[PDB]
């Protein structure tokens, strides 16, 4: 969810700090789409460390 919007040029966040930092010159595009039918397993999927 919101972590999808947490990645962007010049953004501070837990994703930015340690997981996935985008540079502040990002000449690209971020394509995000809900994936409840692809990788969302019932009871919570423990593959998202």
């Amino acid at each position: 969810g919101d972590e999808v919007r947490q990645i962007a040029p010049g953004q501070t966040g837990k994703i930015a700090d340690y997981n996935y930092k985008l540079p502040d010159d990002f000449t690209g595009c971020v394509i995000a789409w809900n994936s409840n039918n692809l990788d969302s397993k019932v009871g919570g999927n423990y593959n998202y460390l």
Partner: protein
Amino acid sequence: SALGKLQDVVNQNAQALNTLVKQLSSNFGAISSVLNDILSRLDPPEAEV
């Protein structure tokens, strides 16, 4: 007052320098006029603006 012309040149130059230095204390719309304060308070993404 005989040497008004010579003194005027000195006064004009000193006055111009003083205004130049006084301009260093202006904000220009920034949060602070001290460059160190901006650097020590904000991350690069928000310090550049």
